Structures are given as C-alpha cells and as structure tokens.
Design a protein around this ligand. Structure first.
Ligand SMILES: Nc1ncnc2c1ncn2[C@@H]1O[C@H](COP(=O)(O)OP(=O)(O)OP(=O)(O)O)[C@@H](O)[C@H]1O
Ligand SMILES: Nc1ncnc2c1ncn2[C@@H]1O[C@H](COP(=O)(O)OP(=O)(O)O)[C@@H](O)[C@H]1O
Ligand SMILES: [Mg+2]
Lengths: 85, 458, 55, 85, 115, 85, 460
C-alpha cells in the first residue's frame, strides 16, 4: 500500500481540527496528529500463521500474511525538523 | 425581509425569519444610500442569523437596514455575448458600451468535471522563449505557473506568452485580472483594441482598488466564462493575472468569519479553497483549456504555504529569481528550479531531453563551485573546473532574450526563436564549439548566429 | 632566476591572502544579516503560536 | 503627493489592529496590510477627459487630470526582501 | 523487586514518548501551552517519573534509558531537561552515523559522573 | 549564597503562572519574570555601619555586613541572548 | 472619603470598582492603605461597569479584596524646581536619601502633551559643550537627542559629569539624571562620585531601582522629564540624562504583558513606537528654551535591526562611541572620532569651515588607519615621504583630541580646560594646513587649545 502525501492527510486533519475549534498545538497542528499517523501505520504488519488460521476459522492454514506500507512525505527545504516529518 | 444586525469590515450579519433562512452562497441585496449592494451568504449561524460578505464598499451601512433575499447565487453572463467586453465580478459591464446581449447566465459556484471526463494530451506547444520551452516546455491543454516575487517579470513574461500563443492560436481567450494594477488592465485593453484582436477576448477585472469580496469572487467569474467556452467544445486560453490575490482575499476575511488562524496566520481552509478553484481549470474530452497563471511569492519565500500549495496543482512551473533579475538577465528564469511534466524523453525525444539535463548538470556544478570561488577566487580551481565555469557563464548569458514587450524597456528589437535553434545552440555551447567567444557575445542574442555576429564586434 | 621567482611567489601569496581576508569579511556580514532575520522570525512565530494557543 | 514613511503608517495600523485582537500574519502585520496601502496609492492616476467632463458636470472639457504619488519606505539593513517593502 | 532487597536492571525503550503523550493530552486538559508546544508541567512530570528510579539502602536499580532527540536538536526542552537526571549520558550523533562508523558515540559530548 | 540553576526557578515560576492562567510573554515566561530575579538578586548587598547599628538597636556598632550571591545560569548552545540569560 | 473598593489582585495588577458616576479617568492616581503604609495605583484602563484597572506603584503583597480606595483626581504629581537640585527621589517624587522633606514650591503632573507646532523654536543652534572631540566631530544641537554607545571602563560617567559641570558653569543651565532601572550599588557609587566632584548641587537625581515593580521603572523617565520641563520653563537650557532607554522599552513590554495586550514583532508591545515618541517628542527646543538629552543605548544582540534599536535610532540626532582601544592609548576622553557621527554636521547647519575641518580630520584618520596596516605588514621603509607626512600629522591630530577635564583633576593632576568651538576649529584647521607641523607630537597631548600647545612646546 502506497499512501501518497501523508502530509496532505495531516493538512486536511488540521483544517477539520481548527474548524472544530480544538486548541492548536505546535505549528498549528493538533496534538493528536502523531496518534493519527501512528495508528494508521501500525496496521502494516506481518502476522503469524496462527492469527491467520483463527481469522479464517481454519479455511487457510500454515500461511503468513503481510501488509507493506510506503508512505510519502514532502519536506519544504530538506527541513526534517517540521512537526509532521 | 432580513435585518442587518452586525457590520464588521467586509462582513455583514443578517437575521431572517427562521422559516425563510437563505441557503449558502445565496445572493442578498441591500440598498446602501444611493446604490445597490449585493451580499453573498457564507455561513448559517444559529437562530436565523446568516453571515455574508459584501460585494462592494460596506461603509455607510447601518444596523437595521431591510435586506432582500434573492433566490439564487451570483449568476454571470456567458457565451459569445461576453466577447470583446470588460465585465465586473457581478457580471456587469464595466466598459462604457451598452448592456451585454446575454442569452444565458451561469452560477459562478460549480462542481469540477468528473474523473471519467478528463482527457490526456501530449501535444507540445511552442513558445518564442528559449529558456521556457527548453527547460520547462508545456503542452496544449496544460497548466503553466509563473512563480516570482515582486517586480521580477511575471506580467512581462505572461504578455510575451499572450503575444505568441494567443495570436498563433485561433480560438477564444479569457483574461482574468485578479487584484492587480488597474493601469495594466487599461494598457492591455487598448493594445488589444489597437490590434483588433479584442473581439476574441473576454476580460474580467477585479483589480486591487476593489474591496475584498470582489477580489475573492472574480476568479470564479472568469472560470465560469472559460467553462462556458470549453463546454461548447472549443479550445480556449485562460490567463489569470495573479492567483495569489484570491488566497489573500480569503485571508483578509477569514478572521472576521470567526475561523481560528493557521500556520503563518492563513485561513485553515487554504488548501481546500485553492483546490476547488484550481480543479475547475481542466481540459476535458469535450474541450480543452490552456492556462497560464502568475503566482506572486510573498517576501520571495518559496516555502510559504500559498506558493507551496500552488506547486502541486500545475503541470509546468517557471520560477523567477530576484538574484538573476538583479544581474539584468531577462527573463529571470531559474533553470535549476523550473521544471515541467513534459520534460520526458518519450514526449520531447532524446536530443531535447539530453540537452536539458546537460544544461542542468553544468549549472548545478557551477553552484557547487561558487562557494569555493567566493573565498579563494577562481585561480585555485582545477583546469577542468575552470572550463565548467567558463561554459556555465556562457549558458547563463545565452538564456537571455529580447522581448517585443521589452522593446520599450531595452530599446532593442524583440526576437522569436524556434526550438531547433535553442537545442542546437545549447548543445554547441556544451560541446565547446564556441569556447573561443567572449561571454558578452551571448548576452541578449536571439540565436547562436547572432552570438557569433555580436562576437565579431565584441 | 630561481631566487627572483621565489620573491615573486611570496609577493603574489601576500596579495592573494589579502584579497581572501576582505572577501571573508564580506561573507560574514551577509551571513549575520541572514541570521538576525532568522532569529527575529523564530521568536515572532513561536510567540504567535503561544498567544493563539490561549483559547 | 509625497507620503513620508508609509512604513510608519503600517506600524500605526498594526498598533490599531493588535489592540483590536485581530490575528496577526507574517511578522506581526495583519493580513489587511496589503489592502491598506493598495487602496491609497491606487487613487493616484491619469484620468481621461471623458471622466473629467462627467465629474465636473461638463464645466471642464478636454483636459486630463492627474495625480502622481511618491511613497517612501524604509528598509532595515538595506533588505529589499522584507514583507512591507 | 527493589524493596524485596534484590538488585534489578530496568530498561526503558524511550522516555521521550511519555512526555509526548503528556503533550497530547495537555491541550485537551485545558492547560495553556508553553515553549515549543510542550506542556507547562514538563519538568514536574519528568522529575516525578525520574526521582523514583534510584538505588536505596535496601536495593539497587540500574537503569538504561533511550532518549529520542527531536531532529538531533539537543536544545529541545525534553532532552535538555532529561540531561539533569542521569549519571552517565551517551550521545549518539547523526553526524558520525552518516559516515557509517557505528556505535556512533560522540566522545566530545558523552560523559559520566564516574570518570 | 549560591543559587544553583536560577533557570530552573524561572521554569518553576513559568509553570505556576501558566497554571494560574496569567498572560504569557516571550518564550511563554510571564511578564514579570525580570522582576523575579531582579528583586531576588538586589538583596545581595553590602550595608553601611549605620544601617547595622540602627537594625541591631546599637548592639553592633563598628561593623558593616554583606551578602554575596553567586547565581548559576545554564545556556543551551552558547545562546546568551535567550530571555532568562 | 474613599469611594472605591479593590475587587481583584493578580500580581501587580489591581482592579478597583467605583460608583457608576465617579470612575477615575485614565492616567489618574489612586491610593490605598496597605496595612501601615500608603500604596499608589495608576489607572491604565476603564472597564465597563465602574471597574477600573491599575498598576501598583509599589509592592502588591498584603492587599485584600474590599480595601477602601481614594481617588486623587490628578495624575501622579511630582515636586519641581530649585528645591530638587542635589536630591534623590523615587518615581513618586519622594526623597530616597535621608535628607528630609523637599522644600517644594509646585507639583506638576508627569503626563503632558509635547510642545505644539507654534511653540517650537524657529532656529537650529549648537550646544557648545567645550569638549573638542564632541564639539568638532559630533556636534550637539539644542533640543537634540544624543546616544552613548560605549561599554564599561571607557569613561562614560566621567564624561557625564564633565557635561553636567560645563552646562552648569559655562552656560547657566541645570541637569536632570533619570536612573531607569539602575543597579543600587552603581547609584550609590554615582551619588558619592558627584559629591566628591562637587557637581551634586548642579544636578537633580531621580532613581528607579531594578528591585522596583515594572510601573515604577516605566514612569521614572517621565518624572525626570517633567522636572526638566520645569527648568526649561524658567528659560534655561537643560540636559536630561537617561541611563538606559532600552530598559524603558523593556518596562513598557513588561507592563503591556501584565495587562495582557497582544504582543508585536519580536514580542515587543504593540505601542512601542508611540511610547518612544511620547517620551522623545517632549525633549525639544521651545521658543522659551531647550532640553537636550544624552541617552545610554544598548543593542539587544548586537542586532541593529531589532525593533528597540530601530525605533530609538529614528529619534537620535548624534551618536558618540566610546572605545577601550583608545583608552589603552591613554587618550581621554576616549571617543572614537570615526564611528561617532552627528547629523548636524552639514554645511547648511554648522557652516563650511566646520564641515571641511571635520571632513579633513575624518579623512586623515581613515588614511592613517589604512597606513597602519602597511606599517605592520611591510614596515616604515615602504612608506613614502607624503605618507610619512600624513602619519606624522595624524598622530598630532589624534593627540590634540585629548583634553583635561575639571572633574578628572584628581587623576591627571592638571587643571581642566574649556575650549570654544572657534578655537578647536582653528586648531585642527591649523594642524591640517601644515602650520604647527614642526612641534613635537607630545606638545599636543592633554594641552587644551593650540595657543597652549605652542606654550607647551617651548618648554617640552
Ligand atoms: N524581458 C524583460 N526585459 C527587460 N526588462 C524586463 C523584462 N521583464 C521584466 N523587466 C523589468 O521588470 C519590470 C517589472 O516587470 P513585471 O511588471 O512583469 O513584474 P512582475 O513580477 O509581474 O511584478 P508585480 O508583482 O509588481 O506585478 C519591468 O517594468 C521591466 O523594467
Ligand atoms: N580626563 C581624564 N584624565 C585621566 N583619566 C581619565 C579621564 N577621563 C576618564 N579617565 C579614566 O576613567 C577611568 C574610569 O572610568 P569610569 O568613567 O569610572 O568608568 P564607568 O564607565 O564605570 O563609569 C579612570 O581610570 C580614569 O583614569
Ligand atoms: Mg506584475
């Protein structure tokens, strides 16, 4: 899965948060933007065969499933110190 | 029916009976002394209060004035009846001629065409300017953006693009003046009328003197006219005088609309407000819009949110540099920052692509050497580094070009250069065919033959 | 000839190093102006974030 | 007309704007700072004789009125790149 | 385990993320912000956690803590604050790591009370 | 007298001020952060013999008294231009 | 009868509620009994409902809600005139020395409008200081603002005492010194040094110590300026010393932050320029007389673009730079003639002779500072017989800038000299024209005017 411009997800979320009058944090983003991206990206995982068997109720056995994520971030001037990067 | 209950700058709050509250983007109307003022609805607050932006001067408004509810959005004349005439944000005639012979009026707020409707095209469109179609060529039906600070030549470059394209092109054109100098609008109007090309051009002018609502909506008015000509099935040229003023007019009213500031104090909705405007400027399977837009860069800060957001929406981007302009190299295009979707070997072919990447590599290496040169001077360089510098300087000079609209400024006749001459010339310079000419031979010459003729007289 | 060339070398080095010292001074003043702008901007930016955070 | 130190007019307007709690923009100037200067200078112009005839109610004919303006701005450290300049 | 009188090792994956969670909740808890977005209580929260990790006369706790340094800016209030609570501080630098010479410990910045 | 980490005193006072919802200044320190350290440090003084004589009601006559203060400040990156320093 | 009551106390900020019909006006002064001492409050804002918001001119501790408040219907009023001379006062005009009550004749409100366009003088006149370097290279105007940029060790306070002495004795004026945020130790030292010099009778001192709450340190400058305006109205020409204008700026920032106004660029108050103008525009040359001001300046990061320097420099007429490098030469006063400037130094103001003389001295010293580089890098052999001449004259010009002060006699052991502007112009013009070329360079050091250099050379 290729998430293109996770930064624009952050920008849309900032728009939503400010229109809901939630308190701005650093660089005007809300504080929970880290929770946004972290819970998005922790879904990409390789699961052991036991979890697959339990989920499939024994239809699939002995196979390990995997989800690989390649997010994209745009820096303004190579400045990695920005909040989202 | 309505009552004014607040007036804060450009923003007016109106109360209506709760069974009759106007919809969003409805036009309201109020008599202000001896004139009629239109208000556009932005938000519905609670209790039948509605918050609106004045399409005109809000001074002289009292509280308690009676407001009339028009049942429709702002609607403007469209079609061939608009051709050759100057119109206001409200679609009113602003030239001294009579009424516009409209047959149809369109609401300026519209949805963008669906994904199914969009069309691809790779037809390269030639320009008379060496640097633009060498470094950042662009196609029929694509978007071009001129990025630059104050006074670096956005308007002059756009006027050359008009002269060349919109006169070798045969269809209709729309020019949208958004928050720019009125003098320049009058000058453009006349030189169109003197050339008798005016009858192909619709002109909408929302210049800086206007209060913020006009500068906010005039761009949508221009897009609505261009969309009428596109949906008729024509191939159309749309020129926008400064797209930045639209975002700035959003910034001016956003605080009065009660919205928390974002980033550098911009409205939180900056990306959406820009995107909904930009997505409507698109070529379609029914008809094609070619667009050239000037994009002002505040404080020359290309990392400011407004230019940064604008960059993703364009196919070709030409970045004008104050540091080059102060050398007197015009057009002041930065070739290490200018870029195009069309610089791809499949569409342009290998010779053009290789020439562009060679020029880019040499100029990058020159940037790498300049910090050594500043402290030590050139004498410390290696004999190949000195050759890199000697060729890079000639390349920088050869990107200069006399413009016809710059005949008044320079005093020297303008030049039109075919693409083949550009590729041949830069390939010759990089191969060292001209290593024996002085730098001055290349400055402000149309073609390489003119460089050698200038070199004979130094 | 060798000795007079050596005198020439030391003279040319002195001239070049003088030029280098002056050019370095120019670079320093330019950089300091850039720095003062960056400092003032960072102060104003974060103070705006703080004051607008009182909501 | 000469306007001496439009920078100082900008500073005065910034004082008025911040005392009214209006959110500042770049540096500390309100977003209104462009409109402030623009509506002043844009008045300066050369108007055609038809406008003069319309305004004078026909009393003056065939004369073009004019108003040249020379605003003055002050740059710190010769920095032409600041916001107000 | 310490109060039993045992000697134990305590490893903390990243102290910084505790402070960052505090920052997340602090705005919604109605506190006005301070410094670079950080909560006003940053030093208090850091001290209240760190002052429990000590070796008493009954038993000893030896602890190794990883500390995230945002953008390697050791000026930032969270790492600058945690510097005061430790006994040995090892600073890993991206300037060295860029050369691939791991462990990438900076000798001119790392130090210990025992030296 | 040696005050170790007056910067930590300033940080503690900032915490107190922000929890009491008092308006923030530069770097979020309250407006009167200068007054804190100034009225602390001005107490460090040498006083003349007549002051000591008056205070002790004449039981000590010939002696001056003094309090010498060695405050400590921690700069972050040699940035002496930070607010509290 | 007290009519208001305290309703809030938040640090230094005190809110008081009055009857609807008797709210005190802005800038008025209130007082309350903080136990066994009176505390003065100055009105900043009138809120709705009879509530007024004030800054305490003193310690806020011990105040309760519900205390009675007396509305003095004038602003803060301070004693003025001859009785103030030689006395130390706080911002409220109360004696901080132990020397008893001030024998006041009048009390003036410290808040005033600047002189109107019709009251301002119709002339531009130089204030002859008697100091060669200042009178030649950085001339003061009457009604001018002058900045001192020197650091420490450079003779700053001795220069201040010399100006005080000459304006009191060689003119017939008086001085006021405003200690905006002084160090108490340095205030005590300065008071004793002015006693030892016997200039104390000539100057009045208002001191705002750093331990004071911000309102005191803000308003002390206006108190001093009010006493200066009193002496001006008598018809005199007056000197006003501000010991650091930067701390006046910072006191304004602190007060506005406590009031909670929205800050401005670099975090200063939004009212910065108007507060500076409110102070500086009162210091002018009226048709009646003039106040001239000498102001210590501090640059927040050596950044000359920072808003405090940028605002201050717009009001300065002259800049005087003191350098320890010149003090290392034993030259006093240690004034750099090349970095000190004065905008009065124009032909239409000082005349062509003065302008040409100062420009000549500037060019010669600049050339000498260039030739010192050659003398170091290559040696005196490189130097031509014309360049040797400019070196030989530059040394003599540099030493002729020295001058013995009446207040420095305990250091030099030589009686002080006062040099008129015509005499210093004549001396430097003489040396530049090549007469007096033949005297030893030590004949010029600490001598006075050139007519005394020729006497010194006769016995040196
Ligand atoms: N090709 C050119 N040749 C010579 N001079 C040029 C050229 N292009 C621009 N200039 C100079 O730059 C000036 C400003 O040009 P222009 O009006 O196009 O700038 P702009 O960046 O669009 O400015 P603004 O942001 O103020 O609207 C011209 O009046 C002219 O002096
Ligand atoms: N005319 C003068 N003759 C001799 N010494 C002088 C003269 N003027 C100033 N000085 C020197 O000034 C020095 C003290 O500087 P001072 O003004 O007290 O510093 P501060 O800035 O702390 O007030 C003394 O060493 C004194 O010799
Ligand atoms: Mg333009």
């Amino acid at each position: 899965i290729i998430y293109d411009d996770l930064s624009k997800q952050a920008v849309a979320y900032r728009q939503i948060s400010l229109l809901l009058r939630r308190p701005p944090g650093r660089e005007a983003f809300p504080g929970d933007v880290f929770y946004l991206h972290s819970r998005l990206l922790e879904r990409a995982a390789r699961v052991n065969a036991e979890y697959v068997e339990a989920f499939t109720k024994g239809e699939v056995k002995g196979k390990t499933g995997s989800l690989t994520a390649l997010p994209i971030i745009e820096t303004q001037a190579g400045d990695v110190s920005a909040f989202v990067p | 029916t309505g009552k004014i209950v607040q007036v804060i700058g450009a923003v007016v709050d109106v109360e209506f009976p709760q069974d009759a509250v106007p919809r969003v983007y409805d036009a309201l109307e109020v008599q202000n002394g001896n004139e009629r003022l239109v208000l556009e609805v932005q938000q519905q607050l609670g209790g039948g209060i509605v918050r609106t932006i004045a399409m005109g001067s809000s001074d002289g408004l009292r509280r308690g004035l009676d407001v009339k509810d028009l049942e429709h959005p702002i609607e403007v004349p469209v079609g061939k009846a608009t051709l050759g005439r100057i119109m206001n944000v409200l679609g009113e005639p602003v030239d001294m001629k009579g009424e516009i012979g409209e047959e149809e009026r369109w609401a300026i707020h519209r949805a963008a065409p669906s994904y199914e409707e969009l069309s691809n095209s790779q037809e390269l469109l030639e320009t008379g300017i060496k640097v633009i179609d060498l470094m950042a060529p662009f196609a029929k039906g694509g978007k071009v953006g001129l990025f630059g600070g104050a006074g670096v030549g956005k308007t002059v470059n756009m006027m050359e693009l008009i002269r060349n394209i919109a006169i070798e092109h045969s269809g209709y054109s729309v020019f949208a003046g958004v928050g720019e100098r009125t003098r320049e609008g009058n000058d453009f109007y006349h030189e169109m009328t003197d050339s008798n090309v005016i009858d192909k051009v619709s002109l909408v002018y929302g210049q800086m003197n206007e209060p913020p609502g006009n500068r906010l909506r005039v761009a949508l008015t221009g897009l609505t006219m261009a969309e009428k000509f596109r949906d008729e099935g024509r191939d159309v040229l749309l020129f926008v005088d400064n797209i930045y003023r639209y975002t700035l007019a959003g910034t001016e009213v956003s605080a009065l609309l009660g919205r928390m500031p974002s980033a550098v104090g911009y409205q939180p909705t900056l990306a959406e407000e820009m995107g909904v405007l930009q997505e409507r400027i698109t070529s379609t399977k029914t008809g094609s819009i070619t667009s050239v837009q000037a994009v002002y860069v505040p404080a020359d800060d290309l990392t400011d949110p407004s230019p940064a957001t604008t960059f993703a929406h364009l196919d070709a981007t030409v970045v004008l540099s104050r540091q080059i302009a102060s050398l007197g190299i015009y057009p002041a295009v930065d070739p290490l920052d200018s870029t195009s979707r069309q610089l791809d070997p499949l569409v342009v072919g290998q010779e053009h692509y290789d020439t562009a990447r060679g020029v880019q590599s040499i100029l990058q290496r020159y940037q790498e050497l300049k910090d050594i040169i500043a402290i030590l001077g050139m004498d410390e360089l290696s004999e190949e580094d000195k050759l890199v510098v000697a060729r890079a300087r000639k390349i920088q000079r050869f990107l200069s070009q006399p413009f016809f609209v710059a005949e008044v400024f320079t005093g020297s006749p303008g030049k039109y250069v075919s693409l083949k001459d550009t590729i041949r010339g830069f390939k010759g310079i990089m191969e060292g065919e001209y290593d024996h000419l002085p730098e001055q031979a290349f400055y402000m010459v149309g073609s390489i033959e003119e460089a050698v003729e200038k070199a004979k007289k130094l | 000839g060798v000795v007079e060339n050596l005198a020439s070398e030391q003279a040319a080095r002195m001239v070049a190093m003088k030029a280098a010292t002056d050019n370095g001074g120019s670079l320093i003043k330019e950089l300091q102006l850039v720095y003062n702008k960056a400092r003032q901007a960072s102060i104003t930016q974060e103070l705006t974030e703080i004051v607008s955070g009182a909501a």
